[PDB]
Amino acid sequence: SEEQLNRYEMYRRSAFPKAAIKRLIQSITGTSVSQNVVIAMSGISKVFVGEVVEEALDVCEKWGEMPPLQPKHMREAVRRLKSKGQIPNSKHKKIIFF
Amino acid sequence: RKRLFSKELRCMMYGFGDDQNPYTESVDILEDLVIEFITEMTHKAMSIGRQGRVQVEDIVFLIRKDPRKFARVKDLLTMNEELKRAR
């Protein structure tokens, strides 16, 4: 239609800027990264945003609300993703044997 | 901290079906997920392989967790060579 073609345009053309993530990663490493790191790390974070919004619209469709996304559907989105191990936290030393 | 992903993330939520005009407190949430996702995939990437940040260990975490992040990183590494072959 005429909205699906505009939505497909924003699904492809949108990206995080490489001039800021290279500034963001290098504040964590200390020295330097490469261009093929920033190209991949800018691409995984678009999949991760698409992992949340496609699942936060499943929270909103499950409850009785409309397309505008309140934060109620966004804290619930991170809760359901973390219970399936999708959201990694490297500060919680987990233990499976008890 | 200011918001470094305020205008970029509004295009992306529209790209996955949200609205043309998302709420400010919803982009407040998604901007903090991405900064933690890049932090909790760099803090764990500087212990694997070596104490640097080569991209041969960024591709390790994407398998056995979610195959969409792995099938969309093999496309960005293949298309880097088909966009330098055209020049």
Binding site: - | R10, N21, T24, E25
Partner: peptide, 26 residues
Amino acid sequence: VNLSEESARILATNSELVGTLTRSCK
């Protein structure tokens, strides 16, 4: 020179269509 000016035109239309009014929520 063609790659330098056309890169910012994919993002310039990404500030005219999406996000016209800024909302909030209780």
